[PDB]
Curated annotation (Swiss-Prot):
This is Probable peptidoglycan D,D-transpeptidase PenA. The gene is penA. The active site is at S60 (acyl-ester intermediate). It comes from Neisseria gonorrhoeae. It is a single-pass membrane protein. This protein was sequenced in penicillin-sensitive strains LM306, and FA19, and in penicillin-resistant strains CDC84-060384, CDC84-060418 and CDC77-124615. The sequence shown is that of strain LM306.
Length: 313
C-alpha cells in the first residue's frame, strides 16, 4: 500500500486546522510521490471522498499547463513580453486581479495572469487545446478503485465559443477532481511524462506518456518557483530549506494551492483545497498556502529529504 501513515496523519490534521480557522465548509488534501505517481496521502473532511468524487473548476491551477504547452510548441519563449491589458470578447471580460500592462512568461506565471495565459492558449486552435486537456486526463476516469469517481468534464471543442477557449485556459468551463489535478502535476515533476497514479508502491516509474519535452518541464518548474518567492501569488507556501514550485488558485469559492519540492528534482507533490472559506481570507495563497507549507515541510522531513539551502527558521 502506497499510503504513508505519518504523512496521512499530518495531512488530515493540517487540513482540519485550516478548515476550522477559515470557517470553511470542507477540504481535501492529496500528496503524491512526484517520481512514481503513487499516492502517499489522501485526506478529506468528514463525508464523501471529495478528492475522487468532486469535480472542480481548477481555475489558476491549470495555468502552468497552458504556459508549458505554448513553450513546448514554440508559440512563445522566455524573452517575449506580452501585452496583458484586460480585454473583452463580445460582452465577456478577460481580466487579471491587477491591470498588468505587460508581462513576460515568468510574470504570467508569477502574477497568475488570466490575460497572459489566455493569449498563449489562443495561439492554438480550439481542437488542439481540447486534445491537450484530454491528454492531461480531463474527462478521463482514473479507475482508482473508489466508488463515486468522477471523470471530470471536457466539453466538445466544436461547441466552444472563443470566450470559452479563453476561460478554459485559466480554469473555468472544464472540471476535474483534485486527484486528477494532482496527477496532471506529474507531467511537470516527472520531466514531461505524465504518470498514471497508483495505490501500490512502485519500484520504478510506471508506464507514462510524454506531454512535454523534458527541457520544457524543467523550465516550467523553474518559472513556478517565482510563485513562492517575493513578487509571486503564493509566498504563503514557501518552505524553509527548499525551493518550491507552486500555483495558487481561487475558483469562483474554492481556495487551492498545489506544488512540489525540491523544485529542481522533485520528490513530493502536495495539493490542498479548502471549500468556501468564510473567515481570514478568500484566496488560494492565503487560505490553502499555510496548510500546504506545513504538509510539504513535514512530508519532506518524514521522507528524509535534505534541504537544498540552509535553514533560517
Amino acid at each position: 500500500l502506497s499510503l504513508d501513515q505519518r504523512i496521512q496523519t499530518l495531512a488530515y490534521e493540517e487540513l482540519n486546522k485550516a478548515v476550522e480557522y477559515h470557517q470553511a465548509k470542507a477540504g481535501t488534501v492529496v500528496v503524491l510521490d512526484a517520481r512514481t505517481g503513487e499516492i502517499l496521502a489522501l485526506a478529506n473532511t468528514p463525508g464523501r471522498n471529495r478528492a475522487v468524487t468532486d469535480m472542480i473548476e481548477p481555475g489558476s491551477a491549470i495555468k502552468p499547463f497552458v504556459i508549458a504547452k505554448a513553450l513546448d510548441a514554440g508559440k512563445t519563449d522566455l524573452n517575449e513580453r506580452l501585452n496583458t491589458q484586460p480585454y473583452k470578447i463580445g460582452p465577456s471580460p478577460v481580466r487579471d486581479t491587477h491591470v498588468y500592462p505587460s508581462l513576460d512568461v515568468r510574470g504570467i506565471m508569477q502574477k497568475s495572469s488570466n490575460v497572459g495565459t489566455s493569449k498563449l492558449s489562443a495561439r492554438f486552435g480550439a481542437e488542439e487545446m481540447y486534445d491537450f486537456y484530454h491528454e492531461l486526463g480531463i474527462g478521463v476516469r482514473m479507475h482508482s478503485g473508489f466508488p463515486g469517481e468522477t471523470a471530470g468534464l471536457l466539453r466538445n471543442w466544436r461547441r466552444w465559443r472563443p470566450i470559452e477557449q479563453a476561460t478554459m485556459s485559466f480554469g473555468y468551463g472544464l472540471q476535474l477532481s483534485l486527484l486528477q489535478l494532482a496527477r496532471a502535476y506529474t507531467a511537470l515533476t516527472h520531466d514531461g511524462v505524465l504518470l498514471p497514479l497508483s495505490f501500490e508502491k512502485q519500484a520504478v516509474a510506471p508506464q507514462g506518456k510524454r506531454i512535454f519535452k523534458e527541457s520544457t518541464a524543467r523550465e516550467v518548474r523553474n518559472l513556478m518557483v517565482s510563485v513562492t518567492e517575493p513578487g509571486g501569488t503564493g509566498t504563503a507556501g514557501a518552505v524553509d530549506g527548499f525551493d518550491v514550485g507552486a500555483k495558487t488558485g481561487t475558483a469562483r469559492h474554492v481556495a487551492t494551492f498545489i506544488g512540489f519540492a525540491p523544485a529542481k528534482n522533485p520528490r513530493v507533490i502536495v495539493a490542498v483545497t479548502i471549500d468556501e472559506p468564510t473567515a481570514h481570507g478568500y484566496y488560494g495563497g492565503v487560505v490553502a498556502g499555510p496548510p500546504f507549507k506545513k504538509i510539504m515541510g513535514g512530508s519532506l522531513n518524514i521522507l528524509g529529504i535534505s534541504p537544498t539551502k540552509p535553514l533560517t527558521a
